[model samples]
Target: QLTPTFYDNSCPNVSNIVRDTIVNELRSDPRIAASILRLHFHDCFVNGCDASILLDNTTSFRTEKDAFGNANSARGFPVIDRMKAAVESACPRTVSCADLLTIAAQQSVTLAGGPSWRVPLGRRDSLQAFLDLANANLPAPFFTLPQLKDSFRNVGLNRSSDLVALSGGHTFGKNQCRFIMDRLYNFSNTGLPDPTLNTTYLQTLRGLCPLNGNLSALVDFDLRTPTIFDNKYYVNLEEQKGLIQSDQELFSSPNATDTIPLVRSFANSTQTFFNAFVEAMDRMGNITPLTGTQGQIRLNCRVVNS
Candidate 1:
């Protein structure tokens, strides 16, 4: 079973090692904190927190890295590799890559000025990747409120609170123009931008991503505090400044009757958002994890142990 002390005897310094590695990386790449957090979310959603997303393409199966949601977007594997190597050196074959990702996600949040919570560990690395499931399960940028709700529900995260709070992860990450292109122009095939977008913010996004523009250009989800993990994302939603359609839909959608109030509450109080975020993260991290002897602890995260 997962527990905060799962590694207390086997790898006492595991948490410290993860925090230090992330801290060191933060100096050179401030955006890495968001990337690692995102990596954990991506890993857990498809096949639970089993590190299935970490495996590379082999002759037997395709990697989730090439899945629709992750291809050309998911990052921070090098950082995970560094953490895995450091943990292995310290405790030998005692730590699971899935647990390392869970810990790193928590550390990344706390280091970025968000709340901290002891991560439950003991998850094992999956022996195989699930490229098809990754594509099917992960939420897309243009998802409607109902679609977003279904995506979460399909994964056993049934609370609207979880959907709203977890979406707060967008508060710090950079979005690719390709993900938001539809909102910028030809929204719903109308050949026009989404009318819900704030006039000023829409112009700004247009400049950052024009028609035929670089699909890979990055844009901050929160303009005011781009790198800080805060509730400004909800505030932006209230102002119709959300960078992606799915994000803005949380507040602007007519069907957002359930989500709007939560967004407003979080926008009104940073503490409330942080508490819900931590809780939602806890639930998300618990999704069907492999424990006991269900899976093996891989020495190398990218391949099944021989």
Candidate 2:
């Protein structure tokens, strides 16, 4: 249904244009690489790879941009504006913003020293956004292993292996403290930090994030190599250093029979994690796409064709 050559004739330079633009953005700020990758994940999980997340809210209704998972959490739309402009200049109204997002995500992973793959193309943008779906579908940072599994399965990522592999994406990017405060200060209403968390690490987190619910406090998901994309996420889990409860659940859950071994495998072999991530992200990119004239190529990514 999708192929790298999908834009061979329509926008032969689409990938090149996207990659070059991302290189420039990543140079100015390496954090943008993680932002772009996360935007791709948020876009695909809610409604395939239609790029509906980029849409601004309208007068009559709200969009996924205003969804709880997106409102202030997701970023990098301006950088995408830069990307869409570059791609449009090379091939006007030819490459879809959806395709540009998918390709940009692939470039982001590579730029951060992670795995890479040939992104399948030809995805079209959705005419409408699904605010409810965005809020309902995205996994919460505090979800248990079972809940995370179910959420991933909803998007066609069923295997426990998929959960572990894709979670490695957290190897880059920082998350806000608001999402982890419950686990940090009062795990399961015990009025104490999660025992599953390493005491020393928990102390560090507590110092960084005041108990006052500072939602703006940012901390690396992977402390070992905060800015680079790697398998240290699994290693962090092994040492009980997972910044998010959902992350630690992969290794700490008693019912995580299938995932624990996979986590061990990824922790020991970056090559193994890289292979699984490429495969998982590829599958993730293929989630319920709108193609064959199902959606349109908008002149501007944030709005439908008029």
Candidate 3:
């Protein structure tokens, strides 16, 4: 049952009527055109991008405090909780929780600002789970463009292939205020990216996080395909109407200037992405892969009490 692939498990992973159903629902979405790469990146990062990065810390990830130095609330764990209910009903021991998490991560990055990634199957679940490791690995909000570049580069992706491919995951989702908060509150006149918010959407974001929703409020980098998997993300990049500072960063950086053509070509053809994605994905999968590890096949996704 647990080989590199068990084609016999034909529809095994499709335990959820929802996975395929959702994929079908997104066929026409513009983001679907470019959001697939998000999955590849989500799956290939720390823990071999095995979806372990999605796990939240048993404790808070960040500590908040006034200059008085009093500690306060923090953020973590929402993703797994949201994904759990769906997995419980739709698939339930049929699909690997880690793999589903990776898929959801891909869905998120694409909806935000990305290209679609090529996905391979047969990955199994892990018996061991870790939370603190995620904090050490996942990219944080305060990271600068170069820092974000080096972060992925350290993991084996190049600036052009890594950043643009990583950003392509944003094709089909909404963002929080914090992800684009600066664009609204302090968009520098000197900065080419003017935050100019979509009035109605901004109101929605403000509702989600009134105090500083700008950073944490929900935002969608790829308005073109909020649900579908398509090429609108690349086209959006070309039109000068992308949503995230991260999306815009690709063009603004000197080296990224050279990479825009590749993004453009990727936008124009899935075939091009298929080739590039296959190469990058294969590269990512081999990165300290868990082959021969003592990981177990998950019957249910949630962590055991241990």
> Evaluated with TM-score, which candidate comes out highest?
1
Model 1, residue 246: C-alpha shift (Å):
0.7
* Deviating ranges (above 4 Å) for candidate 3: 1-4, 7-43, 51-95, 100-132, 140-144, 187-216, 278-286, 304-306
CA lDDT of each prediction against the hidden true structure: 0.94, 0.89, 0.49
User: lDDT of model 3 at residue 280?
Assistant: 60
The TM-scores of all predictions, comma-separated, are 0.99, 0.97, 0.62
**Mind giving the per-residue lDDT tens digits that candidate 1 earns over 125-220?**
898999999999999988999999999999989999999999999999899999888888889999999999998999999999998989999999
Candidate 3: worst-modelled 10 consecutive residues by lDDT: 64-73
Q: Rank by TM-score, descending?
A: 1, 2, 3
Residue-by-residue lDDT tens digits, candidate 3, 90-145: 55544455555545544433443334453444455444433334344446444556
Candidates 2 and 3 compared by lDDT, better number: 2
Q: Tell me the tens digit of each residue's lDDT in model 2 across 128-158.
A: 8889999899998888888999999998898
Ranking by lDDT: 1, 2, 3
* Residue-pair clashes per candidate: 0, 0, 57
Error of 2 at 7 (Å): 1.6
Evaluated at residue 73, the lDDT of candidate 3 is: 15
